[PDB]
Amino acid sequence: MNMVMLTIDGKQVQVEKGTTIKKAAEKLGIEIPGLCDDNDLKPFGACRLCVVEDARGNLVASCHTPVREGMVVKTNSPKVLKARRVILELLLSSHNADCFECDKNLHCKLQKYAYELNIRNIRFKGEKRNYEIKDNGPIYYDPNKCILCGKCVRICEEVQHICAIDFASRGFKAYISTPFEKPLLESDCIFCGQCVRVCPTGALAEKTDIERIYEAISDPNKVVVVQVAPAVRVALGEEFGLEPGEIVTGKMVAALKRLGFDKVFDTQFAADMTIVEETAELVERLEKGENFPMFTSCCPSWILAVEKFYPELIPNISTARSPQQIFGAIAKNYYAKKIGVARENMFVVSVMPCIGKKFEATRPEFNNDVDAVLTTRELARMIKESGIDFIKLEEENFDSPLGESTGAAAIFGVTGGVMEAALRTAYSIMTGEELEGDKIEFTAVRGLEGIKEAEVDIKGKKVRIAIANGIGNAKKLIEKIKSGETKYDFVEVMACPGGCMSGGGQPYTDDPEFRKKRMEGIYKNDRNLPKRKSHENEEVKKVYEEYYEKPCGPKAHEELHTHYHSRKKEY
Amino acid sequence: MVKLKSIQELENLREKIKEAKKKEKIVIRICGGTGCRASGSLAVRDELVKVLKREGFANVDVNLSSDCLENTSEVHVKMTGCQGFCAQGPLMTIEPLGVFYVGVKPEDVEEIVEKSIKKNEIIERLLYHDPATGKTYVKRDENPFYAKQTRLVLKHCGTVDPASVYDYIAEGGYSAIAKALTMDRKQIIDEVIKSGLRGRGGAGFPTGEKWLGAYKNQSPKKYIICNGDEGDPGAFMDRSVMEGDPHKVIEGMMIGAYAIGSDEGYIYVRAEYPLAVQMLRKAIEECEKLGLLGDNILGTGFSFRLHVREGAGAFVCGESTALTYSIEGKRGMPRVRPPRTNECGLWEMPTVLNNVETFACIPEIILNGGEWFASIGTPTSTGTKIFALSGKVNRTGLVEVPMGLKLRELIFDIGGGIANNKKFKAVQLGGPSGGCVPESQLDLPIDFDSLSKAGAIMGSGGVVVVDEDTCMVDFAKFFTNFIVEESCGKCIPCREGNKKMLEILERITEGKGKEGDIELLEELGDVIISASLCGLGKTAPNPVLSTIKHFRDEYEAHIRDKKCPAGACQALAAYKIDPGKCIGCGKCVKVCPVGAISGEKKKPHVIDQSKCIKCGACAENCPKGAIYKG
Amino acid sequence: DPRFEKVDEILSKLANERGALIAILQHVQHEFGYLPEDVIFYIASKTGIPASKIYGVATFYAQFHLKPRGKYVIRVCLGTACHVKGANKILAEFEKQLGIKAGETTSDLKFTLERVGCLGACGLAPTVMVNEKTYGKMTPEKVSEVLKEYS
Ligand SMILES: NC(=O)c1ccc[n+]([C@@H]2O[C@H](COP(=O)([O-])OP(=O)(O)OC[C@H]3O[C@@H](n4cnc5c(N)ncnc54)[C@H](OP(=O)(O)O)[C@@H]3O)[C@@H](O)[C@H]2O)c1
Ligand SMILES: Cc1cc2nc3c(=O)[nH]c(=O)nc-3n(C[C@H](O)[C@H](O)[C@H](O)COP(=O)(O)O)c2cc1C
Ligand code: HC1
Ligand code: SF4
Ligand code: SF4
Ligand code: SF4
Ligand code: SF4
């Protein structure tokens, strides 16, 4: 910690050595514009829109310039403003401008910068960008709106370590493409959605399914049911002017009821069911002591990565379905018979903060259990379209009999929650007594680190457990495990860094501390429930005693389990 | 070709090579350069050797090799590099007659052998006759082209077989490294600094400062890179340097590696140059076989290895970080600074990147001393430079002059005036990154300071001369189009502004220009220069800005009057019908799709400039051809 | 495919060094005439480099092309010393006679156009180099006779 002296706009500043001009001037309440830099990535130097003027009189980029003693910097001289205006005019001279038709309307950064830096008349009119738009599955790519900032390539290469996309061509005709413009499905993409989360323009977007939902609601011979993800209730309020991490569960239930859905449920019931199934499977595997370690299967992107890159780990993957598909099977196989509705006349809609769920819902092995999948942004758009005000709503509760949940299933939206809940159930199953007091929380698996390791002692038996949030950390853990350095018993993997609260379907943010706020909100929501264990749920016991009669039973194995196949297209 | 284990053994074998060379009597040199090879010098050599074999000359050989040291040959046939005067190749020299022959034809070989070889005579019809004066010159040095040239880097060029190492040894080479191996690194570095050497790649950054900075770094591994990309069209200096004597640059690279302490090095060459890469690989393999490259060189303990990396295109790959990325195997996109390549370059290790010409001059400084070198040229910039002058000039070739010679005698005295007795207009210095110099500034001496003062840059070193025939707007458009084509497209300013400027220039040159375009062009150039990332976009608008500064009247005529003063823009041609030479053929009226010409038969016709498309169909189709492009 | 053995033949020669993707691409182009798709995928599988990097490198440089060419490739200088003396008219004559733009081939036939800049000889007016021989001084009228001589 050694400090340096500098003058920014006539004000003395104390910053540590190595800090750039941008981070040094941030402490004076000055925001320098920039489009190609993000808090997760190294500086690139492509937009050239953050230039400042030093004492000599030259323009220098302030995003990758280290600080020095005795430096004089000017940030709002007329020359800098003129250069920024010219650069933005150069960008906007070759933009296809359907801001009426653009999904990123009122959320674009190029539009906001064009407004703020006072552009009203483009002098450069001529050749534009013109390409062809092709379907890439659940991701929509329009190369006519690209500004070539490299954020998607950098996030896919530096952080995710997948390297599914790169630059193509050179000069005015450069663009982002997969090898030979092949569709993303058979490329090395695993459908995590982090590239869609950082794009500053409307080039990368989502595939919408709202029209099918509206045409199924208007159908007078169908019943529509909806399920809500645990992580949607802490980030939905951001779209309506609230702070991150504020619970809007009752408001969102009331809004969904006002939208026309006949029955509103939650996925945490399926989360408890999956917890019970997985804990029973883990106990049986530990008794047998075969096929170690055991990996979870709740993340579709992790399953895709296993199928594509590591096809030798398939026997070690847990066969339990994800909570979404389990809920779909429950609704279309048990609830319909109780109510008296034919299987062909029931519609199931899910609201998820993920993008791999859109692809997962269309897999042939699930027999079309879930008919449509939405995101948080799509739900917010629907709520705003219908005209409901969100601030002044009245709190309501979930429907019956698949609405009540516990606290162990409320922390699946953050990294390490699934492991904590599994340990909570496994301690009770193995020992027979219930944890009381502060022993319920396992503080050794909480945080935002890369690889988290722990050793929980259960009545004299020690289990080696691990958690790895992120694809890169997952690859590192796999390399560590395969070499035989150490042996584990249960491993969790999540494709997004920080858990499902950082998914590609969450509302856009500008605060650099959204992860901490959302994690705090999730933990606070967990702390305010009457039940904190999965086996204390009441409707799960009824479902077992009425339809399946035992976990891992023949009917359960037929309807609540799945199998995986290798997708490795050898070349 | 046995291995060597002592420094003195090299000088011991030098005397044997000298005696073997002295055993010869007659030597003939033929230019093996690309320009002369395009004229058929290989066929000339084949015919000459065939005639010598027929004439009973049993001792005739082409290449001087290790087995040739024991053979005494009465007549020797050589194949050297580019001799410098490419205007009237092929070039042949006969010794000890000292006769300089130009335009040698295979069917003249028999007469040359009969007279120049057997009779010791000269044929005036094959000697150089300057059309300006008519005087006949015999010796090469007596030629006015070579009179003003002080060849220092090209001292061995044109007289040493590039494919033979023993020939290089016989000329005194490989002694600078032997002398340096007995001295300390600091002595060599300080000698280089005192020599006043500066980079020949255009930037002008001192070499001694970079070498000291590399020396002060305590790292296990260091690298050296030799740059021979030559992305500038019209410049063929390092091409001829590599095709003439790769051993000089190899010796310079070894000296630099010893000075800074690096055991590895690379030579970046473009794969488009087959002769250069073949010669470099042959020289490297010969040097490795001889034992001068590898481990424990001459029993000292110095280790060095050399590698060749063939280039694959882009003009932007010459930039230092782009070059390192291309060597590693990625896209040649420049990265952001700091850090610089002198602290962490190739594979995050310190590197030293220099030009071919810079590495070629190190052995001369080592042998003769830096104080002798510093006595030539301006005190702030010593040494000499190699210039490749071409264009609309009488004599084209590779010239070498002391650094500081005035431009007027460079253009006129050496170049022999302007061809076709036209009037000089301007010269382009530096290539696409340089500016345009009019006739009013021909009295300017050449050095970094004066050229930087005048808005131009040294550049690669290419000189192009243009006369009054060419249009300046079209020249600027051509340079802008080349810059647009050679961009890489990473940052907004270069990628967008270059195409915008090209569009504006095309609009101006097609006759659709509007008032106020010059100020917009100047603003775009200023912004692009100020806010670009690498050095390619910062120097891009220089040809346009210089042309605007010096030839604004051309732009004014093109925009306001819709007329081209030089008559080179087709879209602004204004055909005129001469009443005197017209016969009323009416072919122009018939063949023109729009028919802007209306008139009576057997009478002169009138051209309506409003309804004309200026496609040239009228002039080329009428037999009289009275319609002239005015 | 039987060419996967030919690929493996050079995957062991020019791949003992560090960072030799461009050399491998050049050797593949030399052997196969052009640069195909399954060869890229085989290189990606057998070398570890993801196919996106290889595709980007191939699409960066203009030397590499991913489509078969003709037999006789034509090159025009279009340099700073030949553009002055009417090389553009030579290129226009070639385009008019062959019916194909520069950089595009007549694959049905065996001809091809190219835009290689500043060949070795700069003193021989504008310089058109077909295949492996140098022409020298050129005029828009010699185009017809030279094309007739080859065709
Ligand atoms: N065809 C040609 O020959 C041609 C064409 C266009 C332009 N140019 C010339 O090239 C110039 C731009 O060249 P460039 O941008 O590549 O080089 P540059 O930034 O001008 O600097 C030239 C040299 O300085 C080196 N260097 C190392 N340590 C340094 C330090 N501490 N401070 C400063 N420099 C250091 C640079 O390496 P790093 O940059 O790797 O650090 C590089 O080798 C133009 O201005 C133009 O004059 C030449
Ligand atoms: C666009 C561009 C092209 C360049 N091309 C070359 C080149 O062909 N040869 C060369 O020696 N230097 C070139 N340079 C300069 C190199 O960056 C490098 O500075 C030079 O090789 C340094 O050698 P020096 O230290 O001897 O000057 C180029 C720079 C730029 C920006
Ligand atoms: O399926 C499932 Fe679930 O370790 C998981 O994963 S957590 Fe959910 O806050 C939902 O819907 C979310 O997001 S229920 C899923 O993705
Ligand atoms: S979805 Fe994930 S893997 Fe696919 S391109 Fe985007 S960041 Fe890469
Ligand atoms: S697609 Fe989006 S993130 Fe990727 S380069 Fe284009 S604008 Fe940037
Ligand atoms: S990307 Fe931004 S600027 Fe472009 S059309 Fe969409 S909202 Fe408008
Ligand atoms: S971690 Fe959650 S949001 Fe991210 S890919 Fe997996 S399921 Fe989707």
Ligand code: SF4
């Ligand atoms: S200035 Fe031009 S050549 Fe240089 S990095 Fe930017 S776009 Fe590429």
Ligand code: SF4
């Ligand atoms: S070409 Fe000559 S003769 Fe024919 S119409 Fe024109 S001026 Fe008259």
Ligand code: SF4
């Ligand atoms: S080209 Fe113009 S001048 Fe000639 S015939 Fe046609 S319209 Fe008349």
Ligand code: FES
């Ligand atoms: S944010 Fe600094 S160059 Fe883009």
Ligand code: FES
């Ligand atoms: S190539 Fe023969 S004189 Fe230059």
Ligand code: FES
């Ligand atoms: S400019 Fe034509 S070959 Fe060099």
Ligand SMILES: [Zn+2]
């Ligand atoms: Zn003109």
